[PDB]
Design a protein around this ligand. Sequence first.
Ligand SMILES: O=C(O)CCC(=O)C(=O)O
Ligand code: NI
Length: 236
Amino acid sequence: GSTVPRLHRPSLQHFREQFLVPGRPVILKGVADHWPCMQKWSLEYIQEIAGCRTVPVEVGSRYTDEEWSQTLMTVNEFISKYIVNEPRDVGYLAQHQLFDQIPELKQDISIPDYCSLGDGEEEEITINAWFGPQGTISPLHQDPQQNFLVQVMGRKYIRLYSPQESGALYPHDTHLLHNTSQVDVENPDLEKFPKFAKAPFLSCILSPGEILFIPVKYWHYVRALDLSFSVSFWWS
Ligand SMILES: O=C(O)CCC(=O)C(=O)O
Ligand code: NI
């Protein structure tokens, strides 16, 4: 593959014509790099502002695992058990609308201006938190809206496959998981999934301050390389 291109504060028009309309990924630089979250969100700050609130936590290496489960605990409990104290299992505070739950945190982020190029209402943009230790993995899957994934703490390795390559990604046949690949991107079973090997892709390491544009229906796979906090904006 090649690396996702990085662009510094492209104009709305450039973003619209070269990335949004054709559905091409890009990393936006110089857009979120000075949001307050970038300097402010330490573990300690997260504990102070959110520690006592209940959050959903995914436990297990990948959501496609058979032993994978979902539970509830306080943010303080999550940090203690799954981040700081030699964790026994992988825990991920994933896909959670933390900013609706805790409006004060919402002050530390913004809606990217590029979202106004969409046809949807700003109020209907879904903002999710993704907070977890090094080693969290989100299996290869596609989503039904455009996405800006903003990296705040730590880095993520991300692999992207175009919707045109769906055949080689062997989606699950169950209507429920049909937007998830059967393939483990970083250790694929080529005896069972031979078409996967030659499928072209883009990749990147997404670092703090950077925004990855994931076009609607683009397949994406994500592994945290460090203690990580990302904020996703699902928009149309
Ligand atoms: O960061 C991750 O682990 C996955 C994020 C994702 O799938 C999304 O923002 O739609
Ligand atoms: Ni996703």
